Ligand binder design. Structure first.
Ligand code: CL
Ligand code: NH4
Ligand code: NH4
Ligand code: NH4
Ligand code: NH4
Ligand code: NH4
Ligand code: NH4
Ligand code: NH4
Ligand code: NH4
Ligand code: NA
Length: 160
């Protein structure tokens, strides 16, 4: 049920990103700042072997904490394997490289109980084109929670 970006060129995604919007299949995955998938991307770091480090922040004990997820390449440039956040896959749905990137995380063993997707932007501003693409990509996905952040939140501590 999940699109992939064909021919993703990972080298072109390196840098800071901001989580502009996120949505999940289960409310509890994103409900409250403590939710397990309430993670805010800070940076994408493609590696020399073509794997991807995903640097995130999350609230922990009243502080914005860092978490690094190692995502390992597969035969499809846009799909990476992980072992974090109870997930086992990262899918890059679409990117223009220069402005936005859409991705989802899930666990193959139960996507309906694990799907979370994000709209990332390079600059901490609302990009309505990117949000339109995100919402279109998600149109037929079974999301039950959706959040979209404003520039103050993007400049805040862990999106507050
Ligand atoms: Cl957690
Ligand atoms: N490239
Ligand atoms: N759910
Ligand atoms: N919250
Ligand atoms: N990959
Ligand atoms: N996992
Ligand atoms: N697109
Ligand atoms: N591009
Ligand atoms: N926009
Ligand atoms: Na980087």
């Amino acid at each position: 049920v999940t699109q992939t970006m064909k021919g993703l060129d990972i080298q072109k995604v390196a840098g800071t990103w901001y989580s502009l919007a996120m949505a999940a299949s289960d409310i509890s995955l994103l409900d409250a700042q403590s939710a397990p998938l309430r993670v805010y991307v800070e940076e994408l770091k493609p590696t020399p072997e073509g794997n991807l480090e995903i640097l995130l922040q999350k609230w922990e004990n009243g502080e914005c904490a860092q978490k690094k997820i190692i995502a390992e390449k597969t035969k499809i440039p846009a799909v990476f394997k992980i072992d974090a956040l109870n997930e086992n896959k990262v899918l890059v749905l679409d990117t223009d490289y220069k402005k936005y990137l859409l991705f989802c995380m899930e666990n193959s063993a139960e996507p309906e109980q694990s799907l979370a997707c994000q709209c990332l932007v390079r600059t901490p501003e609302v990009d309505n084109e990117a949000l339109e693409k995100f919402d279109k990509a998600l149109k037929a996905l079974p999301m039950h929670i959706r959040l979209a952040f404003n520039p103050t939140q993007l400049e805040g501590q862990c999106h507050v």
